[PDB]
Point group: C2
Chain length 125, copies 2
């Protein structure tokens, strides 16, 4: 993969996640009621963010890549984007992917934050 | 009495004041986690204060999140989901992890006022 193919794929995970919420999330009264699809959507969107960051940054020697690894790298580049990322981690990786909670307005914001990180990577590119 | 509702709102507004005065907001993120945590805990404790006054007492042990959820499930599902989102945003993301995405925090606080108004509005039934 290359600069822009990597960023395109990242954006496809995002749109796949939005598609999942739209089609299977069961939005009623501002909340996605079907928890398993909130988790799937959150995990997929988060993975899109990590795909973009995985390419934009580097490959790491010695062991698994956790939230800290991403935090270090962003913290050297752009504090706004780091903060945006920690917010995406909280909203997509923990609230959605782990807890299964889909407050639709909060989710929309969390995806806006993920798209900001993808579009950042693409701009820096 | 049911100035339980007023005291709940004092916690919420105190929480907003702490973020304004000590949260260190920058580029849309509160930079000082200490105060994000404090604000979150205070706002969340406000909501619990209104709830504790409406639902009263649990016969054995201490309350936790499951006690509030099962009490709210018997009452109304929109309000259940609203409270879960409060729990996610104010108790987990802010109070515990110290993450303050100001736009997201605002929604969390709107959800909290929704719950306090629901209490006020049931108690005057």
């Amino acid at each position: 993969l290359s600069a822009q193919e990597a960023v395109i794929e990242a954006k496809r995970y995002l749109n796949n996640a939005k598609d999942i919420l739209r089609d299977k999330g069961g939005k009623e009264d501002g909340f996605y009621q079907d928890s398993k699809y909130v988790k799937m959507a959150g995990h997929t969107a988060y993975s899109g963010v990590l795909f973009a960051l995985d390419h934009y940054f580097g490959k790491k020697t010695k062991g698994r890549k956790d939230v800290d690894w991403y935090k270090s790298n962003l913290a050297q580049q752009d504090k706004k984007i780091l903060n945006t990322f920690v917010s995406v981690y909280e909203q997509l990786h923990l609230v959605m992917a782990y807890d299964g909670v889909g407050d639709a307005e909060v989710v929309k914001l969390g995806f806006q934050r993920a798209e900001i990180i993808i579009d950042w990577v693409e701009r820096r590119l």
